[PDB]
């Protein structure tokens, strides 16, 4: 058709359906907000939804799509958590009017043909041993932006490298959307929220606080300079039982071919058993506050 | 404050943000925005593009003029005459950005075309089509046209733009415009003036070969190919790079049905291309 029941959760699977409804809402003056997710929603996703909601006269579109193109072969794709019933229930509770739940076939009818090739940042940090990963992310986000044509698109600072790449996408392709980054939601001990946190047993869950503890220690130590920041983070991680650090890196905020001068981001990735966790924090070098 | 726009006059903007704002504002005033991407040095081929765009009711025509550095290997520039030609066509918007304005962060995020981009013209130039789809995407995003107009002359380019559009869910209609030709059939191109008289006379073999082939095709695909090959074989100094019959999307030619016959050839230093619709049987 498609029908749109205002004040209720409308679920569309067809790209054409959501595109038409979005086009219609935008033509009546409502401002279209997009929150792209892969489902398995937790409270940090709900913060994304809330921030979009607070935009005056917004209509909130939340996409749920476990994008196969951002996964490397092996079992990562099949192993991704799927909790559709909880996801949709959470969106209704939040007063979301639109959930977009496309099929793989609707998204990729010609498989991998035209795709987005990210800049050299895609080859680093998370992309190091996963060199097609961000091409996957950026290909899907580009499509979702073209399908929904939102005014603003909301991402978490949690997957900070991804946020940077998305701002690159938007800049480099002249996309008429505002990219809104939302501060990471944390458990009460500091643990960054993630759909991956379900894979930590009680021992791993206890040990996992070491990531955020290491980052906040570094952010405070940073008055004393970069080395002191990094060493404080390293000390905490080294004190933590069964935390296998992948990388701990201090970068310029754009993550790119510029040196760290003053304002930076400290990024960590670590393994707890088979569970790979990420966190990051703002760092100010020589700044007490 | 939206940049100044004067209806019925050629309005020239170099800033991507400016044409973006004027285009958006215009669409709201009840215009349909038509984009014709060019690399300048305009001839009758481009004018056919412009007239196609103009005839759409409520059209405002955006002609972009940008020599895309990214579609050249890992040139004519007539700005004044270009702009005067557009004025004579009643085109109201020219978009003439700089390389710096188009690539302000340099070459970073780009479009990776599909596997068709490595075939045919992507043989000699394996990065050419990445360069084209990247700039076309950017132009589409800047101008946000209802319809975008490309020639059938660069057929493989046109198919790849159709793939871009489907594959990225772009909200634009791609309009293919038939090749404008010289009096003897030679497909128009700024390259043609480079041919010496001997080459210019032999150059008519590309179109002749294709038209022969289209008419031979009632006897089937192999007759059509053999006919085309015969005409090219009658021409001196025409180095055929390829002659291929494909389906209209440039996949394999099916048993019968619509297809497209494509040819490329070097005459001295000048590469010429042509293509034609073929109906098999
Ligand atoms: O995608 C996430 O796992 C995530 C997790 C936490 C977030 C967030 C996103 O946005 C703001 O807080
Ligand atoms: O020139 C026209 O009369 C005309 C009228 C309607 C058209 C059109 C051309 O292109 C597609 O929609
Ligand atoms: O780009 C060209 O050289 C060209 C040449 C001929 C054309 C055309 C473009 O659009 C339709 O007819």
Swiss-Prot record, chain A:
- Quote the EC number: 6.3.2.1
Gene inactivation phenotype reads: Simultaneous disruption of panD and panC gives a mutant unable to grow in the absence of panothenate. The double mutant has a highly attenuated disease response in BALB/c and SCID mice; immunocompromised BALB/c SCID mice survive on average 36 weeks as opposed to 5 weeks for mice infected with wild-type bacteria, while immunocompetent BALB/c mice survive indefinitely. In wild-type mice bacteria grow for 3 weeks then undergo a steady decline, bacteria persist over 8 months in SCID mice.
What does this chain do?
A: Catalyzes the condensation of pantoate with beta-alanine in an ATP-dependent reaction via a pantoyl-adenylate intermediate.
Describe which pathway this protein belongs to, using the record's wording: Cofactor biosynthesis; (R)-pantothenate biosynthesis; (R)-pantothenate from (R)-pantoate and beta-alanine: step 1/1
Note, other = The reaction proceeds by a bi uni uni bi ping pong mechanism. Was identified as a high-confidence drug target.
Location in or out of the cell? Cytoplasm
One BP annotation, GO: beta-alanine metabolic process
Name-wise, this protein is Pantothenate synthetase
GO MF terms here are:
ATP binding; magnesium ion binding; manganese ion binding; pantoate-beta-alanine ligase activity
Coiled-coil regions listed in the entry = none
Q: Which reaction does it catalyse?
A: (R)-pantoate + beta-alanine + ATP = (R)-pantothenate + AMP + diphosphate + H(+)
Instruction: Quote the record's binding site residues for (R)-pantoate.
Output: 70, 162
Curated annotation (Swiss-Prot), chain B:
> Upon deletion of the gene, what happens?
Simultaneous disruption of panD and panC gives a mutant unable to grow in the absence of panothenate. The double mutant has a highly attenuated disease response in BALB/c and SCID mice; immunocompromised BALB/c SCID mice survive on average 36 weeks as opposed to 5 weeks for mice infected with wild-type bacteria, while immunocompetent BALB/c mice survive indefinitely. In wild-type mice bacteria grow for 3 weeks then undergo a steady decline, bacteria persist over 8 months in SCID mice.
Output the Gene Ontology terms for molecular function.
ATP binding; magnesium ion binding; manganese ion binding; pantoate-beta-alanine ligase activity
One BP annotation, GO: beta-alanine metabolic process
Q: Where is the active site?
A: 46
Q: Give binding positions for (R)-pantoate.
A: 71, 157
Q: Tell me where in this chain the PTM N-acetylthreonine is found.
A: 1
One GO CC annotation: cytosol
Protein activity control: Pantothenate exhibits uncompetitive inhibition toward both D-pantoate and ATP, and non-competitive inhibition toward beta-alanine. AMPCPP exhibits competitive inhibition toward ATP, uncompetitive inhibition toward beta-alanine, and non-competitive inhibition toward D-pantoate. The enzyme is most active in the presence of magnesium or manganese. Other divalent cations (cobalt, nickel, zinc) are less effective.
Q: Where in the cell is it found?
A: Cytoplasm
> Entry's CDD domains?
PanC
The protein finds application as follows: Subcutaneous immunization with the double panD and panC bacterial disruption mutant protects mice for over a year against subsequent virulent M.tuberculosis (strain Erdman) infections; mice show mild lung inflammation and fibrosis despite a chronic bacterila infection. This is a promising attenuated vaccine strain.
Q: What is its EC number?
A: 6.3.2.1
Instruction: Give UniProt keywords alphabetically.
Output: Acetylation, ATP-binding, Cytoplasm, Ligase, Magnesium, Metal-binding, Nucleotide-binding, Pantothenate biosynthesis, Virulence
Protein residues bound to Mg(2+): 81-82, 85
Q: What class of enzyme is it?
A: ligase
Per UniProt, ATP binds at 39-46, 151-154, 180, 188-191
What pathway does the UniProt record associate with this protein?
Answer: Cofactor biosynthesis; (R)-pantothenate biosynthesis; (R)-pantothenate from (R)-pantoate and beta-alanine: step 1/1
Q: Which reaction does it catalyse?
A: (R)-pantoate + beta-alanine + ATP = (R)-pantothenate + AMP + diphosphate + H(+)
Effect recorded for residue 153 to A:
More than 1000-fold reduction in activity and 50-fold decrease in the affinity for ATP
The record's listing under NCBIfam families reads: panC
* UniProt miscellaneous comment: The reaction proceeds by a bi uni uni bi ping pong mechanism. Was identified as a high-confidence drug target.
State the family named in the UniProt similarity comment for this chain.
Belongs to the pantothenate synthetase family.
Indicate what this protein is called per its UniProt record. Answer: Pantothenate synthetase
- This protein's encoding gene: panC
């Amino acid at each position: 058709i498609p029908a749109f029941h205002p004040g209720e959760l409308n679920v569309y699977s067809a790209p054409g359906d959501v595109a038409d409804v979005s086009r219609a809402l935008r033509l009546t003056g409502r401002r279209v907000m997009l929150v792209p997710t892969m489902g398995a929603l937790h409270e940090g996703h709900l913060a994304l939804v809330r921030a979009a909601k607070r935009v005056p006269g917004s209509v909130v579109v939340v996409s749920i799509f476990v994008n196969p193109m951002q996964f490397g072969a092996g079992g990562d794709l099949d192993a991704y958590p799927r909790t559709p019933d909880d996801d949709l229930a959470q969106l209704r509770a939040e007063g979301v009017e639109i959930a977009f739940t496309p099929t793989t076939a609707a998204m990729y009818p010609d498989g991998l043909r035209t795709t987005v090739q990210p800049g050299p940042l895609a080859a680093e940090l998370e992309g190091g041993p996963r060199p097609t990963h961000f091409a996957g992310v950026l290909t899907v986000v580009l499509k979702l932006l073209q399908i929904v044509r939102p005014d603003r698109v909301f991402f978490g600072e949690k997957d900070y490298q991804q946020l940077v790449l998305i701002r690159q996408l938007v800049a480099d392709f002249n996309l008429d959307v505002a990219v809104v980054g939302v501060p990471t939601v944390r458990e009460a001990d500091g643990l960054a929220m993630s759909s991956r946190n379900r894979y930590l047993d009680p021992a791993q869950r206890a040990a996992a606080v070491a990531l955020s503890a290491a980052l906040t220690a570094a952010a405070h130590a940073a008055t004393a300079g970069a080395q002191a920041a990094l060493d404080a983070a390293r000390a905490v991680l080294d004190a933590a039982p069964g935390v296998a650090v992948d990388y701990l890196e201090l970068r310029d905020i754009g993550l790119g071919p510029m040196p760290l001068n003053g304002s930076g981001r400290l990024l960590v990735a670590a393994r707890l058993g088979t569970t790979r966790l990420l966190d990051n924090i703002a760092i100010e070098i020589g700044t007490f506050a």
